[PDB]
Symmetry: C4
Subunit: 257 residues, 4 copies
């Protein structure tokens, strides 16, 4: 990409900019990204406890990785005049977000917890720094741009599927919310979200064979195969036709681009 | 679409017509459709019981939504001279159907149940008003027209698959209807529909491995691997080949259109 | 198709031939095929027992259907001079086969069982007469010719998959034939065919998670994750990559033709 | 392929070379490859024990097959001047590897075990000689070259999927490593590799529904559906979008080539 809107106020901008954007620095920063991800994985495997053994190790290790990423972000923003809205606005925004969260956790971990502790969920976004790798390795950036363009179509397919699942959830609560009168009804179709969750399980292959009772469906008279029809129609329509519609969207975009 | 057959008998027809067909009214009615669907879902989640708590709420809420949809249908039909066979015959037919069922339930819910109670299944078609949304949101109407054109070929594939499943059901009933002599035979292959249902379960991943007994298949002599051949051939031919034939039809149409 | 090799020896051949090949007779024979298939299904559902109730009904019903199909085959072969190798050789061969088996069972059922009883497996080919329907209904014949051309390429994929599955069965018998020292080893990997069958189950989604024991894989030292690698590699390669290779072949042919 | 770099030092090279490369010798060696694979399978089925019955049989049988393959490799290398780097370098390299391992096992099995016994894993590469068949049967070599070119893109898709799985593995150990306080936490999310393995099981259809406890998710207040969101998002994004991305890559290459 050509830098056209980022005019040069800074003394050495054109030099530092094309220094950072060089493929050597890109692959060195990809090295740092992958090593920091492997450091997170190593913390979670060799020391997952709440009362960590090598606690310092992980504290100072992510301290060092985060200050290196802060230095890299400063190099970048010096490169394009700290604007980051003109050139590479999306990736610069993601970089700024992750480095801000990291430096916030750093400042609080060394100099006292200023933020509430239930904010601690954000102390789990370190793992997402790895997504920046999908910008350097172009074999990965290829798949990611194909995915990012297949996303609107896929999302539309998902919304249609969600609406159909909701209709089944609405019906399931109407019909089967009293079977077993926790019964099977009261628990798997008790309310709209228990039913929506039951149908999502069934959608991904969770054996809706306990819902249908063969003695009642077959041994009884010809009026009680309603649940058979319910689950057969759901399976066919949602799982076969609509998941393959999502597939079709995915493949059409993946082979068009 | 151009209105060509709907000649103007009514005083203000050309004005009210293009008023209703304007994108603003389309998105307002999409708002009403989605809010009424969410009202159905809210009734089924926050009050699913047979002796409803906030009954009055759901009764008057669907009263109001249905009278608004009746007003909208009257606006539309005034727009095209109450014909609804010339312009947009399919969607106007669906609108008329759902609004008729709704107003029937309204009249009976406020002024006494004129219809039989076992007719009550139709009091569950409210949930399908949401399908009218697939006419306004064109990202959804796109997927729906692609599906509606892929449905002929897909239906043919399903019929071939059904015929193969029926052949297996006949064979299964003929052979394995006496295993365990409810046994496994009597119940999973007892009659043609128990066998057809067993094979539909197996088709969607329900662990046929209880049908095949390893001691009998392997420990016994080399004559008893019939059920292994049965289930392996069924799995291969129906599951792999024919469900991927359904997929192939789906993708061919989804990428052609 | 044009009849070019079937020269006319018979007195009224050109008339009877294009009488049989007319679309009216084709759809009447499709009616007879579907009704006879539904008669087989009705026998298996409403009377599956070995000591049939309405025996006489099924006996004389398939008697009548088989004599009608014998009359139809005679009409056809009179149509093309009893050659059936020149015109429509494949479908005429299938018709001759099924009608021969049917008339054999007829002659033995009315006039004594001339053949051995363990030949009785062929008395189950009635169900396959339905395949002749795939010649009349052209929406089905379309899917069937696309399948029949995708078969030589799907078969090769299946052979590659089988070869890969035979390698994993050899390795499974080599390694895991002694676990649990019926144990899990001696039963699921005991010999080459128990292992091949275990891997076919696992291939179609049968929960390999009982093979891998988490205490042994994780609690023990770093040398015992061999079965994890075995099943992860099998799943990836065979299930994902090779079943989607079969899919790819299927879709390429289904959209090319 | 034309031999252009393999100049002729040997007396009869041009004759023996095009003798070996003739289709007759290729199909005879395909016969030997398939028969030796079936000999391995027969050893594993009819004699899988550690104290083999017909031990000699298998010993001398693989002796004979390996000396025949050694003779064939010598014929080949005499054909192209023992270079095997100029002509058909990949397949000649694979042939040399497998024949070297075989002759090593032969020499040690007849004249004493020179190598360590824990090297014995290589005594299981006989099964992979069958891959050489994928060079002779061109219907198989076709599928294999299409696969070999789809492997770069597929590998990239797998790496993206692995990174997402790792991210879920890092969040799972963070959150659910204390549920049940072996518990469910301490076993299915205990460390990073238990969590990565749990998510790989779930990815291939292993019933996450035991992780999510419906009483806690629904009966409790509206704060505890975190695991529902975890597993629903994992299923959607990895199981539905990313495995179909792998499919899409596979199909694009399989239909392009
Ligand atoms: C959500 C899906 C995003 C995938 C495409 C995003 C994209 O186009 O990258 C844009 C960058 O803009 C960014 O800031 C990227 C930030 C995350 C991208 C990588 C996430 C991988 C998700 C994978 C999970 C699959 C998600 C499936 C969920 C249904 C492209 O910008 P550019 O052209 O490089 O400039
Ligand atoms: C059977 C499957 C139907 C697929 C969609 C219909 C096809 C179609 O062309 O819509 C037509 C509408 O015609 C109508 O009148 C629609 C009336 C209700 C159906 C709405 C489709 C959404 C439901 C099923 C959603 C997924 C379930 C389907 C999965 C099997 C298009 O008409 P038009 O060109 O807009 O004028
Ligand atoms: C083997 C698979 C055959 C399927 C396609 C038939 C081939 C064909 O073209 O029919 C030929 C007819 O010749 C016949 O006799 C057809 C026999 C009936 C086939 C119906 C089986 C469909 C389902 C099986 C599923 C297969 C899955 C198997 C998994 C590997 C076409 O002849 P024509 O051009 O009409 O003249
Ligand atoms: C990996 C697939 C390799 C495809 C071979 C490509 C090739 O051209 O063969 C070359 C070398 O060939 C060899 O030396 C070994 C060939 C191994 C084939 C095994 C296929 C198993 C399918 C594995 C499924 C993949 C699962 C992995 C999931 C990522 C020869 O190429 P050529 O001279 O053109 O002939
Ligand atoms: C590619 C590389 C550079 C990425 C970084 C990985 C390194 C730095 C991480 C990954 C796993 C970590 C090691 C694994 C766990 C242990 C065992 C413990 O008793 C001492 C710390 C120690 C030894 C860690 C040190 C740091 C470590 C080695
Ligand atoms: C592509 C399709 C399958 C989308 C899947 C539908 C999703 C949205 C469904 C499946 C299960 C549903 C969840 C079931 C469980 C609960 C508990 C409820 O107290 C809060 C909402 C919540 C969290 C639901 C949100 C919507 C939900 C997550
Ligand atoms: C996507 C669209 C087509 C939804 C599927 C069409 C509708 C009509 C299908 C889906 C599930 C089916 C229902 C499932 C089973 C029952 C229960 C029984 O007591 C009455 C019939 C009834 C209610 C079926 C009627 C038809 C049905 C409602
Ligand atoms: C504007 C759209 C998105 C919302 C749909 C219409 C409105 C009226 C729907 C959305 C959610 C629904 C509410 C959900 C919660 C309840 C349950 C009960 O405690 C009082 C009624 C009440 C408050 C419902 C009233 C109707 C409701 C407010
Ligand atoms: C694979 C797809 C395309 C084919 C679908 C197969 C369908 C038609 C099969 C699967 C299970 C079968 C059902 C099994 C249960 C019964 C009970 C029986 O007393 C009435 C018929 C009925 C309801 C069957 C109808 C046909 C059926 C629903
Ligand atoms: C044209 C092709 C696809 C026809 C489809 C093949 C299916 C329908 C048929 C062909 C041969 C049949 C097999 C032949 C006979 C046996 C042995 C019997 O004791 C168990 C069933 C079993 C194993 C049959 C299963 C069904 C079967 C596999
Ligand atoms: C994945 C697809 C394409 C390959 C199919 C694999 C087939 C050939 C495998 C799966 C299970 C295997 C069977 C396992 C059971 C037995 C019992 C044995 O005593 C006779 C052979 C027999 C019948 C095997 C034949 C081959 C077999 C059927
Ligand atoms: C299809 C081709 C490319 C893949 C070849 C599969 C081979 C390379 C893979 C698949 C299964 C793997 C084996 C499965 C697990 C074990 C058990 C352990 O005791 C030794 C390692 C060993 C034996 C692995 C070695 C590598 C392995 C054999
Ligand atoms: C979805 C596909 C593409 C990604 C594959 C994920 C693979 C790499 C995951 C799934 C399960 C994981 C394994 C889980 C079990 C262990 C035990 C641990 O003590 C050694 C590592 C090892 C062997 C892990 C290696 C990585 C692993 C094999
Ligand atoms: C491409 C994908 C990775 C996009 C990002 C996925 C992330 C945002 C999704 C996947 C799983 C989700 C998490 C799963 C459930 C929980 C547990 C709860 O205690 C806090 C919310 C939290 C932590 C969710 C936050 C958002 C989440 C982390």
């Amino acid at each position: 990409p050509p830098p056209r809107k980022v005019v040069f106020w800074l003394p050495h901008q054109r030099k530092v900019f094309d220094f950072y954007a060089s493929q050597g620095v890109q692959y060195f920063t990809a090295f740092l990204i992958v090593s920091n991800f492997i450091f997170n994985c190593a913390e979670k495997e060799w020391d997952p406890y709440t009362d960590q053994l090598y606690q310092g190790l992980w504290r100072w290790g992510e301290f060092a990785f985060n200050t290196m990423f802060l230095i890299e972000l400063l190099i970048n923003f010096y490169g394009i005049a700290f604007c980051f809205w003109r050139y590479n606005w999306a990736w610069n925004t993601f970089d700024l977000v992750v480095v801000a969260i990291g430096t916030l956790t750093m400042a609080e971990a060394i100099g006292g917890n200023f933020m509430p502790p239930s904010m601690a969920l954000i102390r789990n976004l370190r793992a997402f720094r790895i997504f920046r790798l999908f910008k350097r390795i172009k074999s990965l950036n290829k798949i990611i741009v194909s995915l990012g363009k297949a996303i609107p179509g896929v999302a539309n397919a998902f919304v249609i599927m969600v609406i159909i699942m909701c209709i089944y959830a609405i019906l399931g609560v109407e019909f089967y919310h009293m079977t077993g009168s926790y019964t099977y009804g009261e628990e798997y179709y008790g309310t709209f979200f228990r039913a929506l969750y039951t149908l999502f399980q069934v959608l991904t292959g969770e054996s809706w064979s306990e819902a249908v009772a063969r003695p009642a469906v077959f041994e009884s008279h010809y009026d009680s195969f309603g649940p058979v029809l319910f689950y057969v129609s759901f399976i066919i329509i949602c799982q076969i036709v609509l998941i393959n519609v999502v597939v079709a969207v995915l493949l059409d975009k993946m082979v068009e681009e």
